[PDB]
Structure 1
Amino acid sequence: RNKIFISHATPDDNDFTRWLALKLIGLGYEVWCDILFLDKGVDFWSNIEKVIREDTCKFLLVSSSYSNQREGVLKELAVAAKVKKQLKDDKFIIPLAIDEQLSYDDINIDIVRLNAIDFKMSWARGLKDILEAFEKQKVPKEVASKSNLLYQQIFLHDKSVIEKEEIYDSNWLSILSFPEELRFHEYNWMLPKRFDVRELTFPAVRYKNYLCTFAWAYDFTYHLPKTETYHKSKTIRIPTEEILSGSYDSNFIRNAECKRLIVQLLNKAFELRMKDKEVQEYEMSNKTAYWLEKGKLEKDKFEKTMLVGKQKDKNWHFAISGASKLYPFPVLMISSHIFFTADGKKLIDSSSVQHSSRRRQGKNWWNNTWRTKLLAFIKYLSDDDTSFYLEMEEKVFVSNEPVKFKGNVSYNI
């Protein structure tokens, strides 16, 4: 008794019956179907009766609108009920509800007390239910690798996410403190106002004539001795909270221009602070990066994370890049890079070999290593316990802990 009998309306349920029979044969189950195993020139009713009585171990019924009141299906159902009564098997007949148009209250009296298997929503979920029921009932099956692959494919087609709380580490460093006011210093000529505006000890820029600084005028006395005699006015003095909230207006300077100037000042201060920290510099096509040397750490094992290593014969170093932004809220985006140096203090001229080495190295790191290295680099960059400052007497504070993100879904490895 190994056969599995499928009853259906012969010319109306052909597609589903053929699909299910071929699938069930795929996983090693022996199936008897009238559209695939009924011989030609044979007494088909006697053959069907003999198969049901002496061969089948299960009886699957394709319960649809066409097969609800089909005479042959009903005769097969009656014989199956008699065989099930003889066998003392409660789960002999298993209807398969495949038609949505057939209401669950209009089913015939033969299967009105049996619980069907829902094939209306999904055929693969119905097949999964059938396979689970068969495994629970220990239906005989003779298998090898292909059958297991198909079984796993059917069982894994519905895998999805679970409702679990998840915490993610980002690369955005939120800015906590800002200078009290934005200062516009009308320096007039001031000996061309130090036209370099890039070698100054503090970040400076010229909008119309007023230098845009968060510091005081006398802080620029060394680079601009004329500012010593400059009358301390530093007018306008927009409070930072007002401008950052999109409240400052009027034709003197637009709000978007003010925000862009603030971003430029933040970037200049970040670069000045990084050059103050004595960190090796790397020039790129679109930005600049900062990487430590071999002797900066002892022994390149900050918090057991490692920042310097050997690939084959070259010394790879983690490198950081910063970009201050105000959208959606004032933060610092931090980008990670890997830079290769042949010797203790040198660089590789060929950018092609540098790029190839970086791509080869980054293939075996993964998110845990990336995050740990980023956090270690940032914590090294931190000057205090929970923050580090950018020098604008005036200064701004940025936390050394990147802002976390929270989600309500996750997976189970």
Structure 2
Amino acid sequence: TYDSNWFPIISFPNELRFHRYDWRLPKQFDVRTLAFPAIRYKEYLCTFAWEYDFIHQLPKTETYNGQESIRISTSDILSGRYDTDFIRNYECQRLIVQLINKAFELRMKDKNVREYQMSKTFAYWIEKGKLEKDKFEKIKLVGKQKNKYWHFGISAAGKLYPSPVLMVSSHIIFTMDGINLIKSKSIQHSSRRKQGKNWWNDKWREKLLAFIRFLSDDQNAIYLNVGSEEKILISNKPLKFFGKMSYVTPSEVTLEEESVLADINNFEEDTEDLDELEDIE
């Protein structure tokens, strides 16, 4: 049996609500500042919640009426049945995955966990002291090696065309004291390559599962407060498959041989590694 890194949609919310504020939306207003995910699709605001929850920062929304706020059934969106000249199906799926990405980001930023900047995404980690006894589901998640503190991480980005699922890309973040991150990204990459041989796939799965269970709030899902009334449930259980044929498990010696093969990849290639070792001291 194998379990993947995917996390499907338990129950997709019914209503996709478009808010045609038109002249009620300031031009200089930043769309990212909203507590709910939204986009300025033409003169509409493609949202997931009601119209009257943005009155805290937008003092013009209260003049907007309900019946111009159109709704779209997401069953036809996921099935491809949705056929309207306003939005076609595929870019609707694209805006949907954009919305759920932003919603997950804001929900998990609301739980007060730290953040590290990647190139085209973001990876996240639990700071020291927040998790008691440094254990979660009998799995180590954030530890200490040599003198640098390593923090396990994830990176999520959805895609729905085979099924409404969400992937997670496992990362690991490093720091020297558990307070501030490493100044140089190359040192982080070096520590990642150093710690790669320290553990192996089973520990990767354990850390990933511990992270998923830690970011969850309920038992068999996570709670995405996409709207004030409507939430999104993510199957925290990873998607599991199986193969008809497989191998026979060997002893632990071949794990050491895999670490040896990591050292073979160390020997076979090298590219300006000498400066970062000689000039670091």
The two structures have a TM-score, normalised by structure 1, of 0.58
Secondary structure of 1:295's counterpart equals coil
- Equivalent AA in structure 2 for residue 260 of structure 1: R
Matched, 1:247 2:84: no
> Contact between 1:193 and 1:224, CA under 8 Å: does it hold in 2?
no
Conserved 8 A contact 1:194-1:224: no
Residue in 2 that maps onto 1:302: 136
Q: Please report how far the alpha carbon of residue 407 of structure 1 lies from its aligned counterpart in structure 2 after TM superposition.
A: 1.0
2:239 corresponds in structure 1 to 403
Q: Describe how 1:137-152 pairs up with structure 2 within 5 A.
A: none
Aligned to 1:23: none
In structure 2, what is the Cα distance between the partners aligned to 1:408 and 1:356? 39
* Structure 1 counterpart of 2:85, one-letter code: N
Aligned residue pair count? 247
Letter of the 1:406 partner, please give it.
F
What does residue 275 of structure 1 align with? 109
How far apart, CA to CA, are the structure 1 residues paired with 2:120 and 2:104? 16
Q: For 2:236 and 2:77, how far apart are their aligned partners in 1?
A: 25
Counterpart of 1:351?
185
* CA deviation profile, 1:160-196 (whole Å, cap 9, x unmatched): xxxxxxx101110111112211111110111416720
1:35 is aligned to: none
Deviations along 1:322-366, whole A, 9 cap, x unmatched?
Answer: 112112111110111111111121111111111011011011311
The answer for the alignment partner of 2:248 in structure 1 is 412
1:228 pairs, out of 45, 62, 73, with 62
1:140-289 residue pairs with structure 2 within 5 A? 167-192=1-26, 195-289=29-123
The residue type paired with residue 303 of structure 1 is E
**Deviation digits for residues 108-143 of structure 1 (CA, Å, limit 9, x no counterpart):** xxxxxxxxxxxxxxxxxxxxxxxxxxxxxxxxxxxx
Q: Which moved more, 1:182-191 or 1:264-273?
A: 182-191
Q: CA offsets per residue over residues 39-64 of structure 1, 9 Å max, x none?
A: xxxxxxxxxxxxxxxxxxxxxxxxxx
- Aligned equivalents of 2:219, 2:166: Cα separation in 1: 19
Decide which of 206, 211, 215 is 1:377's aligned counterpart: 211
1:151 paired residue number: none
Q: CA RMSD in A?
A: 1.3
Q: Is residue 361 from structure 1 mapped to residue 195 from structure 2 by the alignment?
A: yes
The equivalent residue for 2:256 is none
Q: Which runs of 4+ in 1 moved over 2 A?
A: 233-236
Which residues of 2 match residues 95-134 of structure 1 at below 5 A? none
Q: Which runs of 5+ in 1 are unaligned?
A: 1-166
Larger Rg: 1 or 2?
1
C-alpha separation in 1, matches of 2:208 and 2:132: 18
Between the aligned partners of 2:5 and 2:28, the Cα distance in structure 1 is 36
CA contact (8 A) 2:37 2:102 kept: yes
Q: Which one-letter code corresponds to 1:290 in the other structure?
A: Y
Check whether the contact 2:19–2:70 (CA below 8 A) recurs between aligned residues: no
- Give the Å deviation of 1:311: 1.3
Q: Which residue identity is paired with 2:244?
A: N
- Any stretches of 5+ residues in structure 2 without a counterpart? 250-281
Cα displacement string for residues 290-348 of structure 1 (whole angstroms, at most 9, x for unaligned residues): 10011111122101211111110111010111112112111110111111111121111
Report SS of the residue matched to 2:99: helix
Deviations 1:84-115 (A, max 9, x none): xxxxxxxxxxxxxxxxxxxxxxxxxxxxxxxx
SS in 1 for 2:16: strand
Q: Distance in 2 between matches of 1:322 and 1:405?
A: 20
- 1:210-237 deviations in whole A, cap 9, x for unaligned? 1001100001111212111111224431
